[PDB]
Design a protein around this ligand. Structure first.
Ligand SMILES: NC(=O)c1ccc[n+]([C@@H]2O[C@H](COP(=O)([O-])OP(=O)(O)OC[C@H]3O[C@@H](n4cnc5c(N)ncnc54)[C@H](OP(=O)(O)O)[C@@H]3O)[C@@H](O)[C@H]2O)c1
Ligand SMILES: NC(=O)c1ccc[n+]([C@@H]2O[C@H](COP(=O)([O-])OP(=O)(O)OC[C@H]3O[C@@H](n4cnc5c(N)ncnc54)[C@H](OP(=O)(O)O)[C@@H]3O)[C@@H](O)[C@H]2O)c1
Ligand SMILES: NC(=O)c1ccc[n+]([C@@H]2O[C@H](COP(=O)([O-])OP(=O)(O)OC[C@H]3O[C@@H](n4cnc5c(N)ncnc54)[C@H](OP(=O)(O)O)[C@@H]3O)[C@@H](O)[C@H]2O)c1
Ligand SMILES: NC(=O)c1ccc[n+]([C@@H]2O[C@H](COP(=O)([O-])OP(=O)(O)OC[C@H]3O[C@@H](n4cnc5c(N)ncnc54)[C@H](OP(=O)(O)O)[C@@H]3O)[C@@H](O)[C@H]2O)c1
Ligand SMILES: N#Cc1c(Br)[nH]c2nc(N)[nH]c(=O)c12
Ligand SMILES: N#Cc1c(Br)[nH]c2nc(N)[nH]c(=O)c12
Ligand SMILES: N#Cc1c(Br)[nH]c2nc(N)[nH]c(=O)c12
Ligand SMILES: N#Cc1c(Br)[nH]c2nc(N)[nH]c(=O)c12
Lengths: 250, 249, 249, 250
């Protein structure tokens, strides 16, 4: 029987590439999404056309709230309902916007940025572990630039740092259960689709390896390594996939 | 005019030592507390007996909620109300208890551990900056963040977020002359509930003296960071751990 | 045409595992060795029996000296002489023994430990780059460098310098399409001189399975980094330690 | 009795500021130098004018060689010969120049950069420890930008990384002897006198805190803290003094 994976925020970009590569590797996938219903459903449809009943969709807001634990439990439950198992969890879903220190209220900013990047990964990790030849692991999507953060992105940065702490803490604690916990950390490496080419060029020019952004597929490559049998001794590790960007001084 | 400092969770232990050393250095202090009302007022009394009108208390729950921003705004406001200025913020208050992955609901555990260790520090930093000499913030971090205690994920996540805040705020507040730094104890004043046998186990692990840090030793690093001897230092976290984080399993 | 790889200290243990896995992936290999001539030739024989003319041996002392640069240039040269190209360099060869601060002279200890772990990797990196597809260098680092073994200062300094080389060379060789990465074991194949009781002590420290890594497991991470699956990865060091570095004292 | 300190490369700049501040604090000082004989003697004169018999000079090349262990032993011995004790060692002396991967031979480059920045610190640490209410410590001058290195400075960077490892290893090992081992890490924060003012300004403009370099005094301030009784529980710590420079992404 085929293993199953949950990928949060899997409708687009890096999450989509991860879900696709897991599927191509033989995984059945839960495609979690928030707002991108059309994209998520069309992805699941494409994957199911490839192999019957190997993809399902699951909608959840991962903003922090008192119902977030239940939402995360339900995401994991959806994998068990659909496929009878859950082997891999990929914490990809993420809010990303500036929150300067000096329309959204600050409590909403906190809830979205810390919720998506840190608390939901924690609760999903809890639910994943509680519900557990096999090769069980979690991959957290981190950020290679966390020590050299984007100006005015404190809450985002705090969230990604907490995600590092979660990766380490969970690796330590879940090791007895055979659950490995690792991370993949892109740099400022695949720029937002809205951004102008000229603004994208400012970042690209800074990347030592090829003066270009990573493809979503290149990020997904590191995720599939970490979930694979080639990484069976690897836990608590975060792989930078940044083309040398974090090595470049101001 | 004397400068003024806010120290969160200042009624006992390390927070108390920080507040005392700041006061001894000439600062007027806001002693924030949560449940330790008697201890907090006792300390304020002692400091005011030393120099009149140089200490006030301020009660606030630092658990995450939709009113945490208001509570943090009020803590900073209380410093301006009492002393007309706020020069130093010390983010000391912290919940610390295990939250295994496998009586408190998980929602509550998240709110207390992430709230106290990370979100409140953020909101206090915001309010501090907004309300603005030698201005700085010191965050009480943790030297063992990369070698965490078993089953302390939420606490560890909070302290990691605190590192990210220290860096992010240092970067962003530098143009305003506000320095943001951290002090990271390994083992200092051990928990009150911890038995002497378990305390001795931890003490035995420390290379420098086989003993825990005094609260005063931790405070010493805090007062260096706030002092004029640290005027070019921002985004730095000073370990004060007697070599504990250097010891392999 | 098949790509070619240089693996230093490849006659046994992790170096052999790396050479073997590269060969199985389709690489022609230079098996560098120092004292293990019989093991190195035996390995080359086995690989050549599998595919004709795909393995050669190369002997060199990688102790620091004024001729180390020439020795390292010759190792790289031997790859070009044998295979007409050099696509991958694996810096595996390493001296490892205690050097307490309080038979070998200290100058010899410095020369061997810093030479093998740091200076030779640097000189090999220089010669590799100057002689220049999917080109990359993999440095064998150490996951425990921030939690070092007691009285292993020179070894530890060498491994830290190897981190700096990994970073510096990644930055500088990126314009040439040469990626530079590392693999950091915690405990893998334990020293042959180590008694089984001491080996079991180390094994028990490992959260993931209470066991050391096989050489193959280390080699797996090396082959990932050299592969097309790692084409955007440079300046990264992958821990392969089963969580060892996460465990506090 | 006054405590005594060895400061390597103390004739100029940061080393000089350190020597001066230690002296002002009540230390007797050994002023080590390499080529700056006039500056070293002039400093010794100035300090002895202040308090008689509190400063001596010691010349040594700290380039790696088979005679380096003896040279380092003699530097420490000079403190004991002059002052009868040695309480503090400051590893400040440092070669700093580019060594591209693609007049000096590479073996000389290796000897100078790795010798001054790492091997000599190690040998001096050995001799210091062997020769031992007291407050013994070593302060190593590190570099805040070691993870974001200057282009083509690989040997320098390797040296500074090795200095980090020495700081940690020696802290662990010398703790039982009451010898603390710490570091102070400036950024690109006090620029080379040979650098043109226009290039200096490019670097100054990068520093978030004040858009300016650190004074040598400010670096010395951190050294003074670490040697003081206010740092009695601090060992294996490296204090960045970089005005936020290392926090700034490319
Ligand atoms: N792109 C980069 O260069 C880069 C750099 C560093 C780190 N990373 C990390 O890598 C991961 C993937 O990056 P990306 O750029 O592909 O991400 P992205 O497109 O910006 O967002 C990924 C998904 O997160 C989901 N999301 C946002 N808010 C949510 C919420 N409140 N509840 C549930 N889901 C929510 C969104 O789902 P819907 O579309 O369905 O609404 C979105 O599609 C992220 O964790 C990111 O932080 C990326
Ligand atoms: N002690 C150590 O060995 C050690 C080690 C590493 C890091 N640290 C860090 O150093 C700092 C001080 O340590 P410590 O041992 O002195 O701390 P602590 O005694 O455990 O706690 C300090 C104060 O935090 C306040 N606090 C707890 N929950 C709160 C809440 N929900 N809202 C508002 N305040 C709350 C408490 O105030 P009330 O009593 O008034 O209720 C308490 O007095 C902490 O940030 C800690 O994480 C300490
Ligand atoms: N084993 C572990 O648990 C572990 C843990 C952390 C890191 N690592 C790293 O992973 C790598 C492989 O480990 P390992 O245990 O397989 O290594 P190893 O057996 O201790 O040494 C590998 C080879 O290094 C060569 N070597 C030693 N001194 C040399 C010199 N002066 N000149 C030239 N070659 C010299 C030897 O070649 P000859 O036999 O031909 O003389 C030896 O076979 C090393 O870099 C190591 O530091 C290993
Ligand atoms: N300047 C900065 O912004 C900065 C940044 C990061 C780190 N640091 C670190 O801070 C420390 C002081 O910096 P700095 O700029 O003041 O240093 P510096 O002026 O470049 O050099 C300090 C001294 O090192 C000595 N030296 C050089 N080569 C030597 C050799 N082969 N043998 C013995 N001594 C030798 C020289 O002594 P003589 O003059 O007597 O010949 C020189 O005066 C250094 O360790 C440096 O790496 C500085
Ligand atoms: N560029 C960029 C992004 C970074 Br840095 N972190 C991110 N996180 C999310 N979720 N999306 C993004 O586009 C990015
Ligand atoms: N021992 C201990 C403590 C650590 Br580690 N982190 C802590 N945080 C708080 N707040 N209190 C404590 O006693 C401790
Ligand atoms: N055990 C072990 C070893 C470590 Br840790 N680093 C090493 N380096 C080499 N070269 N050999 C070894 O056996 C080990
Ligand atoms: N700017 C600058 C310098 C750095 Br970064 N590291 C250095 N090291 C030495 N020795 N001298 C210098 O001027 C500098």
């Amino acid at each position: 029987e085929a293993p199953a994976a949950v990928v949060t925020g899997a409708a687009k970009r890096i999450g989509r590439a991860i879900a696709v590569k897991l599927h191509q590797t033989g995984y059945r996938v839960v495609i979690h999404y928030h707002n991108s219903a059309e994209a998520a459903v069309s992805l699941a449809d494409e994957l199911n056309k490839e192999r019957s009943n190997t993809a399902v969709v699951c909608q959840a807001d991962l903003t922090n709230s008192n119902v977030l634990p239940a939402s995360c439990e339900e995401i994991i439950n959806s994998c068990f309902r659909a496929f009878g198992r859950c082997d891999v969890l990929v914490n990809n879903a993420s809010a990303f916007y500036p929150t300067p220190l000096v329309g959204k209220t600050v409590e909403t900013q906190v809830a979205e940025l810390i919720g998506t990047n840190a608390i939901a990964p924690f609760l999903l990790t809890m639910s994943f572990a509680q519900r557990q030849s096999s090769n069980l692991s979690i991959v957290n999507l981190c950020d290679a630039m966390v020590d050299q953060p984007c100006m005015a992105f404190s809450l985002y940065n705090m969230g990604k740092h907490a995600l590092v702490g979660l990766t380490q803490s969970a690796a330590l604690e879940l090791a007895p259960y055979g659950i490995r916990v690792n991370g993949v950390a892109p740099g400022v490496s695949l720029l937002p689709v809205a951004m102008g080419e000229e603004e994208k060029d400012k970042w690209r020019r800074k990347v030592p390896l090829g003066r270009r952004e990573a493809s979503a597929e290149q990020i997904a490559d590191a995720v599939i390594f970490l979930v694979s049998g080639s990484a069976q001794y690897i836990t608590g590790s975060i792989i930078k996939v940044d083309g040398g960007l974090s090595l470049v001084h101001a």
